[PDB]
Symmetry: D2
Subunit: 124 residues, 4 copies
């Protein structure tokens, strides 16, 4: 269990996610891209690794969004890998990989990499 993960998080570019952390390591919820209607909402699922933190170490986690809903099918999926830190400056610091379905010929250029910082309050 890591109750501090459960809730709404915002990246610095206008996306949102609402996650529930389950007692035995499940992450489930919804990822909302910058626009922010039903057209913009996607299922997310992942896992987190709770431990008896010894040195206010972060909590490791990851999740996936496949970019398909009732309004869009981007032929793509993103995974985020990172850690949650609680407290007054609570954050989920992540790196992400975005893979698109490609032909074999273009498979070398299938995967973008980047980073996201999620906070409990919106940027700007």
């Amino acid at each position: 269990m890591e109750a501090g993960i459960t809730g709404t998080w915002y990246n610095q570019l206008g996306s949102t996610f609402i996650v529930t952390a389950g007692a035995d390591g499940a992450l489930t919820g919804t990822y909302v891209t910058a626009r922010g209607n039903a057209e913009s909402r996607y299922v997310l699922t992942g896992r987190y690794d709770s431990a008896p933190a010894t040195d206010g170490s972060g909590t490791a986690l990851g999740w996936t969004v496949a970019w398909k809903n009732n309004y869009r099918n981007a032929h793509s999926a993103t995974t985020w890998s990172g850690q949650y830190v609680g407290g007054a400056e609570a954050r989920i610091n992540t790196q992400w990989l975005l893979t698109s379905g490609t032909t074999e010929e273009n498979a070398g250029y299938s995967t973008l990499v980047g980073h996201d910082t999620f906070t409990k309050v919106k940027p700007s």
Copy 2:
């Protein structure tokens, strides 16, 4: 639905996973590290993006394993991002990020990157 994903896949280093692809984009199953007893089995969850493939393009997907079970708590989690290609040379080509829980001071060095190729038959 992408029925060809469902089943057992092997990386080139001795790990296994058994996944079920659900009809509306869910991935669920178990990841087994090289040793291969109950000590070595972990929950995995992820998502895939099925589409009406136009040019035998791959199917985008991702999943997460938190490295905690009844026998180990590695304070870590890995995400795989990649694509499934079916047929005679079926494969899931992936890149992965492995994040460990760290102190703030060591947060810069929290995340390893690499790659895995999964096939329907074992290597060697």
Copy 3:
């Protein structure tokens, strides 16, 4: 030629580099880690791709530091890949890979990934 690259840049964690951009795409200079004496100075070399910017697009570049000098031999090297943007909010936004020399057995865990933002003035 991209004269705006030439000079001193600071990351948000206390490192510095002083680079010269050569007329035909060379980057040469010195990278200084957080402490900031001779013990902390390393050779850097890389390349940049100048073009007749059409839409204030960034300038692609990359460089390498091998973490060996007269005072340290970390058995490691980092590459930065990113783009330079000039003007009032000048920056070099980068992602980096840090590889350590390993045994074959540990080769899978050889490479860390992260990100750095460089600015013309120091953080904080």
Copy 4:
């Protein structure tokens, strides 16, 4: 000095590079893409970290190619980060980042990630 690095290396997809390892950590040479005429040749520069190998550990290195020559200007640059291992199965195992110059709006999707294995003899 690491004399075993100096020479010609081939990736598994038809590219070539010819590198010279200098005595004090310099890498210099030429990268040739799959086609393989003057149109396909680019300057490379990087660094390697030589050390008194204790356990046949690899040698850490990195290099950059800006994708501009007299025939092409791709507004891009790739960095490779990896390690050299000598002997009967000599190889340079790498991960790479490819960044394109973008607008600010598209900066999030500027950087592709992948992997290359270089050997002394051609694939296939």
